[PDB]
Every structure is written in C-alpha cells, then in structure tokens.
Subunit: 253 residues, 6 copies
C-alpha cells in the first residue's frame, strides 16, 4: 500500500503538502478475459504497473507522480457486449470522462498527464488532439502498457492478443489470488472470411461471437508468475524514465 | 472474503457464465477528499462493501443472486472542491452518458433490474432514470444512497455529520481499518451561509467547500469506532437484502 | 397587473431605469392534474406566489425582483407522456434552457437567481452544480414552492401528492375561474408491489398508467380557496425574506 | 376563455373525450419591443390568432384544434442579449424543445402539428427536416403569423420590422390593457455600412446595439386597434382554412 | 486554374506571403439533380461563381479573397434520402462543421466569412446567430448564389426549383463536359393536396417520392450555355462588389 | 472521367439502374503539405486510387463500387491550426458526418463501406465500433492508402511522413498540373525534448510550429511521377482485391 502515489488508497492528509509533477491515469475496461482472468484485468494491470513506475521515478530521481483510480469504461467489439457484465462505452462517453478529469486537474494546477491503457480497444489520439486546442498548456500523452516492451523472449505463445500468456502471467505476478490458470480455456480464435482483412489491407473489428469460443484470444497455458515479473520490470523502467523526462523537460526546448 | 459469485471486481467469466442473476447493483461513488484521514475513494468503497454483503445475505437467505458491478468513481461536486488536489467533478451529462452505456449493455445481456447504490450525496439520478424509463420501458432502475437506508441518528454521537464525519469514518473503520488513521483527522469544523433562509432550507444552494470547511470534512469524526460502524451497517445490509429479494420476486406493479 | 415585477405583463419602458436585485424563474410543467385543474397549474402557482413575494419584498424592504415568464417544460414519469398534451422534457433539454437563461441574464449584469419550481418531477441540483463552475459569480438557488412551508396541518387529505387538496386550494385562491372542484375525481392511487420501494429504501418513479385513474394523486374534495389563502401567506413571507437576504448578503461573510 | 382549444386554460376533464385533428404550437420570444410593447408580444400574438382561428375552424367545419402554450424561447441578434430580460435561445435548445414536444404528441397519437411563430428570428425548417426522418408519419408545418397576409395596404409606416405599426396595432386590438402607445419611441434604425448587405445580396444579422435606440425597428406612432382588427381578420380566416385542409387531406393525394 | 483564390488547387507556397481580406465558403449538397446533372452540382456552381467573383474583386479593387473547398453536406427532404448516394446532413452536423471551420479561421486571424450556398435546403441564419455570440469579432454572411439575381427574366421555364433551366444552363456554361442535356427528364412535379400549403400560408417540405418522377423540379430542356453565361455575369459582379465592401468597411461605421 | 464509379462526376441517370456492391468513402484533410503540394492532397490521392481500384474490380470481376466525394475534414495537430486555411475537425464532428453518411447509405440498401483515408491524423476505429452496434448489418472497414504497401524499394528518402517523396511522387503521377516540385522545401523536422516520446514509449502529437519549418516532414526532392506510378500499381491491385472480397464474402463464413 502506497498513499504517496496511489490515489486508490490515499487521503488528503498524505498528499496536501507534497508536490506532484505528473498525473497518471490508468484506463481499462470491464470485459471478460477467457474464463480465468478478472473482468477488471485491463484496469488492475496498468494500475499496478503505474504505481511501480511512480515508486521508481520517486526513489530514482525525486519525481513524484500520482496514479489516479483506473477508468473501467472501455470500447468493445461486436459480440462482446452480449457477454454478461461486459460494458461497452461509446467514444463520446469516454471523451466526456477525460474532459471532466482534465478540467479538474487543470484547475488544480496540474499540467502533465499520461493515460496508461490496459485495453487495446481504447484509442485516445483524437481526444488528445481536441484537448490540445482547449488546454494548450496541458500535456497529455498516451500508451498501452503492453506495447512498451515487445513480448519476444518473454513469452512462448505466438498468438497472444487478449487474456493470453502475457496478461495471465502479469496477473499471476501482481495478484495470484485473482487467477486460477487451471480454469483457462485454450483461447482458440478464428480469422475473417475476407482474406484482405486478415492480411491487414484494411481494418474491421473482430466479432467475438464468431472469432472466439471462451472470449480469450491466445492460449494462456504456459503463463507463470515469474514470466510476468520479468516482463514488467523493463516496462516499469521505461515508464519511470518517461515520467522523469515529462517532469524535467518541456515538450520542445 | 473474496466472492466471485456476487463481486464483479474480483470475478471472472468462468464463475459467472452458468449462473442466473436476478438483480444488478451499481455502486456509484466519487473521487473526493474526506477530511484528512479517509480515502479519496470512500464513496466508492462503502457502497461496494455494503452491496456485496447484502448480495451475500440475499443469496444465502433466498437464493436470489445479484451482481455487484465495479464502483463508478465519477461524482458531482461543489464549488471549492474541484480545486482540491485529485478531486474530479463530473458533469451530469457525463454521468448520464455513463449510465446510458451501462444500461444499454446490461439490456442486451438480458438483464432488466438495476439498483444504483450511491455513496455520494452530490449524485442525483432521478432525471436520468426518468429519461431511461422511456428508452428502456422494460428495464427497472432504482436509486438509493446507502446512508439513507437507515438514519444515522441514534447510531452516532456527533450532531453535525455530513461528510467524512463520525458515521463515514466508523463504517470505514469497520470495513477497511487499514485505510483510516483516525489520529490524522481534523475536527471537520463547518461554517453556515450568511443568508439565513438558505440555512433554514427555504431554498437550496450548494455549500462552497472553500468558504465552509477547513480540512474538507463536515463533522467531527473523532468519536468514530469500528463497532459503531458494524452496528449501523447491520440494518442497512438487511434492508437492502430485502429490496434485492423483492425486486427479484415481483414486478413493480402486479 | 404589475409591470414592475412581472415580466409576463411588462415592457422595456417600465423596467429600463430600475435596478433589479434578484431574478425569479418560475418553472412548471404541461401536465394533466386530475380532471379539474389546469394543464398549466405548475406554472401558474409558482408565478403567482413569486409575484406576491416580489411585491412584499419591494414594499417591505425596497428590494426589487423580476419574475420571469414560467418555463412550461417539466420532467415526467412513465404513463404520463401518453396522456393527451402532457409534454415530457428530457433533463438535457431542461439544462439547455437554463444555460441559455443564465447566459443571457449574466450578460445583462445579473448575478442572483432563484428557480421557483411548481413541479416536483423537476430536479435542478445537477444543473446548478455545473453552472457554478461555468459562472462562479452567479448565485442560483432552487426551491419547490410547496416545500417552503409543509402542508401537514393546512390540509385534511392524508395523501396529497399531485392535484390534491393543497394544489386545488391554492388554485381556488388565485384563479377560482380556472378550477371547478365538482369536476374532480377522487385521485385514488395504487402503491408498488415491491414493499421496500413503498417504504422508500430505494426510489423508482410512480407509473401513472398503473398508479392513477384520473391522473390525480390524492383526494382534492376538501379543497377551499380559504385554505389556499392561509397556506400561501407564510410561503410568500418566507420567500420575500429569502429575496431580501439574497439582495442584502453575500453567500458567505 | 375556451377550454376546448386553448390548453393554457384547459383541463383533462374538458379535453379527454374529444377528438383533436391539428395541434398548433405558438412559438415566440422573450424580447423587448420598443418601450411600449410587452416582452411576451411574440407569444401573445400568435397564441391569440391561433385560438381565434381554432374557434373559427371548429364552428364552421367541426375541425377541432388544440392550441398548446406558447414557447417563450426565441433566437436573437447581436446586441439584444445585453438588453435586460431578453433571452437568447440557441438553435440546439430550440430543437431539443421541439423534439420533446413532438415525441410526446406522437405517443399520444397526434400526427399533425403547426408551429405558428411570432418571432422572425426563429427558423424551423432544419428541425422539421430532421424530424421528418425520425417521425415520417408526423406532419409538421411552420408559419409566421405576420406573413400569412402581407401588411402592404393595412398600415402606413414603410419600415415596420419589430414592435412597429402592425405588431402594435394587433396588440391594441387583442390586449389594449398591455400596451400604451404614447410610451413608444420612434423605432429609428440604422443600416449597415456594407451596401450590398442593405441590398440583400447576402444576409448578416442586424446588430441591435448599433442599429436601434429604443429596441424597436419601425415607427409605431400610427397604430390603432381598428387597424389591428382589420389586418387579423384575413389572417384568422386563412389559418382556419389551413387547419381544415390539414385535418381533411393527406399531404399528397 | 487559380492558386491565388481557389484552395482546391492552391498550396502553402502560393498563399503564405499574401494578405487575404475575405474567406468564401461554398456549401453544397450531394444530391440527385434530375437524370442529367452531377450529384455535386450544388458544390460546383457556387465554387465556380465564387472563384470568378474573387478574381474580379482582385483585378478590379486589389481585394484578395480565398475560396475554400466546397462542403458537400446538405440538408434534404423526405423521399430524397432513399435515392442512391443522396446524403442527408443533420442541422447539428452542419453546425459542428461550421464551428470547426470558424474556430480554425479565427485562430489564423481571419475575421470575415461569406457562406455561398448552392442548395436551398441549407439554412445558416441560426448557426450565424449562435456563432455571433461565441465569436463577436467574426463577421459571417450567407447567400444562395441563385438568389443574388432573380432568375425570372433570364430563363423561360415556369418552374425552376431544382435541376431546372437555370442550374442546367449555368452548368453547361462552366462544365459542359459534366452534362448531356439529351439525358434530362421533364422534371414534372406534383403539388400538395393541402391548398393552403401550395399557397404558402405555411411551409412543409416537398416529399420527393410523391412530388417528382426523375428527381428534378422544373423542365430544363430549353437550357443553354449562353443563358447560363448571361445569368452568372451579374451574379459574379454583385458578389465581387460585396467582397470589396466586406473588405473595406466595418459592418457599421 | 467515369460516371459509373466516381460520384464527383456522376449523375442519377448513369447510376439508377446499376447494382452497387461496395461504397468507398475517401476521407482527407484540408492541410498545408510543404510549400508545393495541394491543400487537398489527402482527399485527391485516396480518391484517385479508389477510382482506379473500383475500375479494376469491375473490369476484372464485375464487382461494382461507388467512390463517394472525398470528405475534406481532417483531425490536426497543435501548430497546424494556425497555418492559413488549415481546418481542424473535432472527432465528434467527424463522427456526426460518418453517422449521416451511413444513415443515408443504409436507407438506400447498402450494407458495405470502406473508408479510405488520405490523412494519418484520421482515426476511425472508435466510430466504427459505435456504429457496429447501431447498424449491426452494415460492415465498415477503414484503411490508410499509404499503408497498403511499404515504401521500401519504391522511394529513397528515409523520413517521409508528410508531403514527402511518396505523396509528392503520387501527386506528380495523378495530377502533375497541381504540383511543381521546384517549389518544395526540404521538409526538415525536429524531435521532442522528451527522449521517451521520440522512442515511442508513449504518444503525444508533434507540434507543427516547433517540429517543421515549411509544414512538410520529409525531403520530397527525389520525387518523380514514375515512382508514383510504380507505387500505386500494387496499392490499387490490393484494394481492388479487398473490394471484390467484400462484395463476394460475408465477414465470417
Ligand atoms: Ca461462437
Ligand atoms: Ca529511459
Ligand atoms: Ca425488508
Ligand atoms: Ca424569514
Ligand atoms: Ca455593387
Ligand atoms: Ca516555428
Ligand atoms: Ca488480393
Ligand atoms: Cl454484442
Ligand atoms: Cl479488433
Ligand atoms: Cl450541498
Ligand atoms: Cl415519482
Ligand atoms: Cl436580422
Ligand atoms: Cl421544400
Ligand atoms: Cl503526430
Ligand atoms: Zn485485457
Ligand atoms: Zn481488453
Ligand atoms: Zn463520503
Ligand atoms: Zn461524497
Ligand atoms: Zn402540479
Ligand atoms: Zn406536476
Ligand atoms: Zn415581436
Ligand atoms: Zn421578435
Ligand atoms: Zn442544385
Ligand atoms: Zn440542392
Ligand atoms: Zn498528406
Ligand atoms: Zn495529412
């Protein structure tokens, strides 16, 4: 438990006299993840990663970041909304939320935000361009935690898009109590009938009811806690460096 | 302890996919300073914990199975609160968009009954519910503040107890003692309006936190105890369990 | 007829050289009231109450208030929209209206507004919160006219929620020509089949099509003009006092 | 007082057993009208015309029309918003209002609506077009009451755009108690400095602050009740004829 | 080809060192025009007229105007949206477009815009009113090109509302290669069955599915390039004159 | 000029009796492109490529596609909005436009759409997600034309992000009349001061006012028409294939 950098457990007494340089907003989804992983995986993983990166930036450079509570409202695909307790969030709803967050942070004096997404269906570039014009003095960056470091050499499964080896391993590391690997299905996935879409000539969202069986995309069976521990270490290190640099530099000098 | 059957925050598809759910409970909170000593997420944490307890009671007692959704941390706040660090004011339209998206999804999934259990008195859902009643005429949405299910009067000593006070502190001490250090609390001294009729409640204006409060609390929380909190939530939990069961077993009118 | 404090009958020549301290916005509904009361009851009653309070405030303290034209756009319940000429107004529509009113009044130099509602279906706290941030120097209060003084002990009917003894008495007092009590039905109402909702553990809107027969909720038969006269006197006095204090004090001092 | 065709005075008891063929929606503004005319002129005038026309159609044809309460929310020009108690309504606010009105009337089974406007600043064609796709079985027509019959030859003043001889004469006829013509300014107006805008090659809204003194456009001096009575007789007959034809014919046959 | 005044062919190099006085936005529609005219007629015609007008203003007075690319998003009528490739634009969508265009132009330092519409179903008065409050130092004017000079006098056909003799003649002048007059139908149109709507007591949009056979409204078959040339000459001169006056005068002086 | 597959030149008479299988929506931007390339480069290029692919699909397989007029409304970066005649479009405005296009196309019976973007600032995945739930029977795919084929071996310049060698070459091929290579600047660009943003640990938009001098990103000076001609051949062939597969297969089979 870290009240200095994790708002989810913090209180005003602990934060009111401290200077904060960068705000971190974990952004996930309420989404089924194969049969074995939590509905809130895309919130929990970026939150725990962000807190660790915040701890490193503080101990390493004295840069203090606050990790906000994660946003559980993700954008989903055809076939997912019909699965129980999967919440599809319209883009405009997500934008309204980010607007309200940035408005408040701005009033509070903050000027640097990183959105750390745990859901690949979330896209923030358009929202960020629009807010760049409303709040010209407020820097907003965006990343998916799972794109900071390539999974090559860290995991065996070749297909690993959702609730696969990487997500399961990272969950096993941070919260082994939240996942029983023995409960996982194989995460078999089916391609489109339009070859050009499989060749990525153009993009169409995967339909979950046609493309998946257990809601996972990728076999998680070789996942371990140790694999998760090893993978997140360079992720945390690179994110901490970004927080430090966002704190220490203007965007252009 | 961890309950994947009724607490979506810890649950997974494997546990939920072969079970029948009757009622959905949406805890709706705020990200909001609570004096110096309570968590920023107090208004999310408390209704989540109450609702899970009531879900567990309804299940063991009647076989009525409810799902408690993840708490919504987007509250509507007052003047002077937005400037406090990490407090997030949410516009009513933003909240309505959220509830629209939740209801749309739950409706596609086959669900037809939802209770919004609020932890924050600044949240108001009657307009959203009226508007959604016309869009989804087969979908029942109720709303309650957890702290209005049973009056705190009798259960606590402090007479002023509106925000981060004795009652909220006690219930946090009960459910999450590790999250609250009572020794860190301020007195929660509050200042009334200079317009008497507003103090008398002839009309309503929002309290300005910057003018009205010193430590962001409204009410002295210092006689708070875990046991006071435990005793107060017992009847709240039992009444909510009863509402869950009757929502599951009856239509609104018969 | 009072052109000084009632915009419904006023003109620019009467008002242009006067100072106004508080603006009053009566907000009602276009809504069936049992068989006997006007569709515009919820506009008419706060308008007349407001004008009398404004007159009292001026005579007694020299505080001059303008009563704006009533908003006939109320928020209604399931079953009411199907009744002829009942106009359900969405919350967003209502918010748009109040934004336009506040924006104009602000440009005109006004900084003090009371919304005096005649329809309990209307809720303004959310709107007021959001406008507080948009216009921080603009004070907006809201009240239902019928909550200023409790009707318990002014009226005999136990149930009296809509077009019952209280509303009818007050209409009989202000506009006896618009109400014929002989035409009223009993206003019988049915409760919910979910006991916890009648006990008010939680809130669900009453469904008019299941809960009412004639659109009324409460028996109006014991209504008299004299009861209405007696009931509005302290409401008007209390509101006049509010206006005076709003004109004469800052929100905090 | 006519509870049959005027909702502003009507009740559910008088309306509930009767068939209504056309709904008429008076749509005005809250707007200063020189020094002499009511703020609510643009609501009062279409309301009274429409009621008289509805009474004519009913007595001569048995076609029954309901005249809804006037919408006091108009679209205004630069300079008007700063005049006390003028309320500028955004187009989107107006459209939200009509959508709510039409959605309610539609559920009630009504299929034919006339928006009878009293304010030239109001434009409903875009709203009507959009609602024709949402409710293809719902006929919406719009008219300005003051364009049903040209004022040429009914009034003396050449410039007569706002709070001028025609509107004043029509108010003198319907509500002589609400207007004292001796209080009027000359309603002097200044043109643009861009000649082609005065020639109407292109449209720009008139700025009230630059172009008017007393808020009127056109001298009302020669207004009389006689002139008002004479002008409205053919307007009322034309509108009664339209109500009858909307009632008895499909748009196309 | 004119890179000085036509953005559709221009590049930053050509424009970056020149002073621009007025911005011209052609606004059209994607709409069937009888059998023979282009879908983009309403974009092409005002574009070509604006460019010629800008060229005349430049040569004659040294006033330099930029003609923006045409907006192909018009507001359409019942029965048109079912015709292949006709795109109906909601009023709110058009307003969002104009807001974005104005916000960008304002930031660039421009303060004068003319919207030149090619489609009668487009209405900008409301948008202009709302924007005058948001951008008080930004003059926006609007005109339909075909209303700058009345076509009566210049053309034979009695009816000429859409894709008729005037539009066909003007297209044959500017782009003879895009129109084969031999393919045109007669553009026969049916009136309403409600007499008063044909007489224009009130407005209802024409229903294209009931009212037209070939999608045209007006017989175009006497159209000629010479007639089109003749008609655009005085339109081009009047518009050039408006651009020069807009550039050289404040709205009021 | 091909009226069969290019709506910008087509007319109802040519299309009304033909079966169309897939709709192609070119989506561009109004944006400075170094000194030498047109402001409409991002509209013109995907338009011309789409028309060629539509011709190939028809000649080769009998699959008939309509290329809609290009949408000139792009999402832009800080620094771009201040450049003359650059029009930044908010995400919500873009989505309102796509909502309108799809609504119309759906009414007309079409069930398949490819958005072919010319501007990398445009992002359609969110809009497409939200529309999949609104119109579950309507397939929407998105592609950037410049991502269909890698530039490796086709062009020399290493940096080529905007108005560089590839775009300049492709414009020289399709419209040599619209580009003078001799006018081009070097398209020099500058990185961020935040090293982790240059390493792509997270995303922030480039600020044009700090990162470019001439508005281009990439040296265009080795561009040729023959390089453009060679490059678009496989782009056209792959897109033709996608159009055919879209016409002939369900998304999943
Ligand atoms: Ca399946
Ligand atoms: Ca680093
Ligand atoms: Ca009970
Ligand atoms: Ca008092
Ligand atoms: Ca001239
Ligand atoms: Ca620079
Ligand atoms: Ca292929
Ligand atoms: Cl689904
Ligand atoms: Cl996908
Ligand atoms: Cl409050
Ligand atoms: Cl209720
Ligand atoms: Cl005007
Ligand atoms: Cl029309
Ligand atoms: Cl970028
Ligand atoms: Zn995930
Ligand atoms: Zn995910
Ligand atoms: Zn609280
Ligand atoms: Zn709270
Ligand atoms: Zn009432
Ligand atoms: Zn009411
Ligand atoms: Zn008027
Ligand atoms: Zn007016
Ligand atoms: Zn046309
Ligand atoms: Zn047109
Ligand atoms: Zn480009
Ligand atoms: Zn581009």
């Amino acid at each position: 438990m870290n009240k200095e950098v994790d708002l989810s457990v913090s209180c005003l007494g602990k934060v009111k006299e401290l200077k904060y340089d960068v705000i971190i907003l974990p952004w996930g989804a309420t989404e089924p993840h194969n049969l074995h992983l939590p509905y809130l995986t895309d919130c929990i993983l970026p939150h725990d990663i962000a807190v660790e990166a915040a701890e490193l930036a503080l101990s390493r450079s004295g840069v203090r970041c606050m990790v906000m509570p994660p946003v559980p409202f993700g954008a989903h695909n055809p076939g997912q909304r019909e699965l129980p307790f999967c919440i599809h969030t319209r883009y405009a709803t997500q934008q309204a939320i980010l607007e309200d967050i940035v408005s408040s942070l701005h009033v509070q004096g903050f000027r640097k935000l990183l959105i750390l997404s745990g859901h690949g269906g979330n896209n923030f570039k358009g929202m960020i361009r629009d807010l760049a014009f409303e709040y010209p003095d407020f820097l907003i960056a965006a990343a998916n935690w799972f794109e900071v470091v390539s999974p090559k050499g860290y995991f065996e499964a070749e297909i690993d898009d959702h609730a696969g080896e990487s997500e399961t391993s990272v969950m096993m590391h941070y919260h082994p109590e939240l996942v029983n690997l023995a409960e996982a299905g194989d995460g078999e996935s089916k391609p489109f009938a339009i070859a050009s879409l499989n060749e990525k000539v153009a993009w169409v969202p995967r339909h979950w009811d046609k493309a998946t069986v257990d809601s996972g995309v990728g076999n998680p069976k070789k996942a371990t806690a140790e694999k998760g521990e090893r993978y997140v270490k360079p992720i945390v290190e690179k994110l901490a460096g970004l927080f430090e640099e966002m704190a220490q530099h203007d965007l252009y000098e």
